[PDB]
Amino acid sequence: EHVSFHVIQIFSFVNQSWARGQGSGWLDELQTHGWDSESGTIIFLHQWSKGQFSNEELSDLELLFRFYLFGLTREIQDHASQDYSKYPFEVQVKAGCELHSGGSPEGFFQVAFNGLDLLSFQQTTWVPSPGCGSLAQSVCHLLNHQYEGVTETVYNLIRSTCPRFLLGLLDAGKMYVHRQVRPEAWLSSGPSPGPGRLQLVCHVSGFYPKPVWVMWMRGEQEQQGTQLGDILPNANGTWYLRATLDVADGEAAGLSCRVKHSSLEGQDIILYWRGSLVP
Amino acid sequence: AAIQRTPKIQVYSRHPAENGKSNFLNCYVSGFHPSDIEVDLLKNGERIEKVEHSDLSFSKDWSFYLLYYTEFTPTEKDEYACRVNHVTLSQPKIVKWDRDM
Numbered sequence A: 001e002h003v004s005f006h007v008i009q010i011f012s013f014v015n016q017s018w019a020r021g022q023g024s025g026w027l028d029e030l031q032t033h034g035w036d037s038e039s040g041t042i043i044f045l046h047q048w049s050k051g052q053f054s055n056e057e058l059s060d061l062e063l064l065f066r067f068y069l070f071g072l073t074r075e076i077q078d079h080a081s082q083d084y085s086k087y088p089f090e091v092q093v094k095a096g097c098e099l100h101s102g103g104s105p106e107g108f109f110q111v112a113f114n115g116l117d118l119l120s121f122q123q124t125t126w127v128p129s130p131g132c133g134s135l136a137q138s139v140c141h142l143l144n145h146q147y148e149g150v151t152e153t154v155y156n157l158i159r160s161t162c163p164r165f166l167l168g169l170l171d172a173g174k175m176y177v178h179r180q181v182r183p184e185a186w187l188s189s190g191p192s193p194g195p196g197r198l199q200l201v202c203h204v205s206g207f208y209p210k211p212v213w214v215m216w217m218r219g220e221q222e223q224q225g226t227q228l229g230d231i232l233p234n235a236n237g238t239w240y241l242r243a244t245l246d247v248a249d250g251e252a253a254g255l256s257c258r259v260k261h262s263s264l265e266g267q268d269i270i271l272y273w274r275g276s277l278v279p
Numbered sequence B: 001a002a003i004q005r006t007p008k009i010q011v012y013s014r015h016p017a018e019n020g021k022s023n024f025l026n027c028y029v030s031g032f033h034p035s036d037i038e039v040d041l042l043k044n045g046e047r048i049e050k051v052e053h054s055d056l057s058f059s060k061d062w063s064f065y066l067l068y069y070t071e072f073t074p075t076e077k078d079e080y081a082c083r084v085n086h087v088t089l090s091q092p093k094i095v096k097w098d099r100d101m
């Protein structure tokens, strides 16, 4: 019952002149917003992506994002052109908010330097990451002293603007966020894990929401030997999942893949292994 | 300090590989860092030109992931692969798409 909304930013500082930035907005795992870096604008990936915010409010958000990009790049490049051997380097920012069951908002703002935790914004104070100290401590000191309104703006964004915008987004996109897409399931014979051995593969593709149960079983006995893969993304917000099992040939008859998913409405998906048994 | 993470490359079709029916080939490149990566979808060896891909994103450990996908009609004669190059790879890694999977 928990939902989040995130804005992620990825900055690559290549030299004291070049630096490229990317940004996107994400409701849970569905991307809802992109960022056009040439125009410096929000890209609304869905009809409901404006989330019951006015065009004035959103153009002002774009204004603030543009100014924040400008100043962030300016100050970082100012510090780095004095350590040019440090180029290239990457900065990642994950801001946003999580709506907890009962309606409790927890905002968060986290920054990584070169894929390592640099610092976070806990409650109302910048906190450096334990480890990666000197640079963290420095940046955290600068943020907690020189950069005035930056801190208050961050707090109000992740604690007030973010949850309001999030609930507006869920209200506007109620038909897409709560959709149910029935998966397609098929069977295959993977690579022989040995002579006599036999690799049964069960594919389940095209399902939303992401939670899914896939299991090889004989009757009710779930085979403890099933190897479940990762849930991988398809385009257009559906998911794919492979579950395999290697058995002895001749003992493969009677095995069956079983798939449970909310979209099924109870009637689970069952696919028996046929092999060369069906004329 | 800096962390370098090698990309995980997974190739899978959106629908059962029915020779003659259109389909989508997905290459999911995940868990890599830094962000600069070069991903190509290859049909029989040459690079496919009509390739879409998601906006860059990153997991909670800050490692990046990307979904490259293309419409394609698989045939018996055709072999499809995903070629990834990254600073963590001495030379580009090529993962063939297992039709039989």
Ligand SMILES: CCCCCCCCCCCCC/C=C/[C@H](O)[C@@H](CO[C@@H]1O[C@H](CO)[C@@H](O[C@@H]2O[C@H](CO)[C@H](O)[C@H](O[C@]3(C(=O)O)C[C@H](O)[C@@H](NC(C)=O)[C@H]([C@H](O)[C@@H](O)CO)O3)[C@H]2O)[C@H](O)[C@H]1O)NC(=O)CCCCCCCCCCCCCCCCC
Residues within 6 Å of the ligand: A068, A071, A072, A075, A076, A079, A080, A081, A082, A083, A084, A085, A086, A091, A111, A113, A118, A135, A138, A139, A142, A143, A147, A150, A154
């Ligand atoms: C919207 C805005 C709000 C947010 C903004 C806030 C964040 C912005 C940025 C925050 C960073 C602040 C923390 C800084 C920490 C450290 O200060 C400073 C380094 O510390 C020491 O510094 C010294 C220099 O001073 C270094 O020694 C230099 O090493 C070099 C090797 O390449 C050379 O050897 C050089 O030698 C010479 C030479 O050979 O000629 C001698 C000359 O004298 C020198 N000439 C000088 C010095 O003037 C010349 C120079 O390079 C050029 O001038 C020539 O072109 O070079 C020698 O000087 C020394 O290593 C180094 O340890 N860290 C950094 O750099 C890290 C990079 C900065 C940003 C990285 C992290 C990103 C910020 C964090 C996220 C951003 C904010 C988070 C939240 C977002 C908003 C809420």
Ligand SMILES: CCCCCCCCCCCCCCCCC(=O)OC[C@@H](O)CO
Residues within 6 Å of the ligand: A007, A008, A009, A010, A021, A022, A023, A024, A025, A033, A034, A035, A041, A042, A043, A061, A065, A069, A095, A096, A157, A158, A161, A162, A165
């Ligand atoms: C930056 C911290 C904000 C946290 C609270 C956000 C409140 C939600 C309202 C935002 C509306 C649109 C969301 C995505 C905006 C576009 C974007 O992805 O921009 C990234 C850019 O900046 C990096 O180049």
Ligand SMILES: *[C@@H]1O[C@H](CO)[C@@H](O)[C@H](O)[C@H]1NC(C)=O
Residues within 6 Å of the ligand: A014, A015, A017, A018
């Ligand atoms: C700075 O980085 C950009 C991005 O590749 C490049 O075009 C430019 O030439 C670089 N400067 C150098 C290599 O001196």
Ligand SMILES: O=S(=O)([O-])CC[NH2+]C1CCCCC1
Residues within 6 Å of the ligand: A028, A029, A030, A031, A208, A210, A233, A234, A235, A236, A237, A238, A239, B054, B066, B067
């Ligand atoms: O509806 S949803 O399934 O949550 C959307 C998933 N988008 C994926 C496609 C791009 C690659 C990673 C995320």
Ligand SMILES: [Cl-]
Residues within 6 Å of the ligand: A019, A020, A021, A069, A073
């Ligand atoms: Cl820029």
Ligand SMILES: [Cl-]
Residues within 6 Å of the ligand: A187, A188, A189
């Ligand atoms: Cl078959």
